[PDB]
Every structure is written in C-alpha cells, then in structure tokens.
Amino acid sequence: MEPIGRSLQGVTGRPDFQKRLEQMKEKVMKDQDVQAFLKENEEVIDQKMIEKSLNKLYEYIEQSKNCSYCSEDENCNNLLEGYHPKLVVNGRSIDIEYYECPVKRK
C-alpha cells in the first residue's frame, strides 16, 4: 500500500523544452488523422518511433491537412499544392509523403 520505489518523481532536468515536448507529445496524440494512422500501422510503429518522428508527426498536423485544389482556403500556404500530406513508416522513422488530391479525379 506504501510504494517505497515511487516512480512519481520528477527529474530535476525540466527546461521549457520539456514543456514543448509534453505539449507536442499530447498534440500529436490529439489529432484525428494521427489516430487513424497510428492504428493503421500500429503493428509496425513503436512508441519510441513516435517520439523519434515527433517532429514529423507534429509538423504533419500543424500544416494544411487539405489543399486549395479542393478547398477555397486561400489562406493556407501550400507549396506541394494539389496534394495532401500522409504519414508513412520508412524503416525506423515516420515520414510525410504527399498523395495527389482525389478531387483532381472526377
């Protein structure tokens, strides 16, 4: 009833960096596309892979999920316009590839 080795002990190393870290960590695990991709490739992806590819997954959700080739969102700065970003597992790292907007097909 009395855990002698309580793991609830914060390491003294906690700069504002960790505040970003925990924020983005949650933010990534808060996006709907991420949920779908996670379970899609959960057999391949590991927890650590997520934290390693954190930057990618966070940049993924932060950018335009859609594209102006379909949406009238002119306020979204897209350079890979005509495409949409999707996550892909490449070895031990998760990358962001663009697939062509299906709206190009009628």
Q: Extract the annotated binding site.
A: 67, 70, 84, 101
Alpha carbon distance 63, 60 (integer Å): 6
Phi then psi dihedrals of residue 74, to 5 deg: -80, -10
- Mark residues 19-48: x for contact with Zn ion by CB under 5 A, - for none: ------------------------------
- Taking the least distance from each CB to Zn ion, the nearer of 16 and 74 is 74
Phi then psi dihedrals of residue 42, to 5 deg: -70, -20
Q: Is there binding between residue 98 and Zn ion (CB under 5 A)?
A: no
Phi then psi dihedrals of residue 81, to 5 deg: -65, 145
Q: Is there binding between residue 80 and Zn ion (CB under 5 A)?
A: no
Which one of 49, 51, 63, 69 is in contact with Zn ion (CB under 5 A)?
69
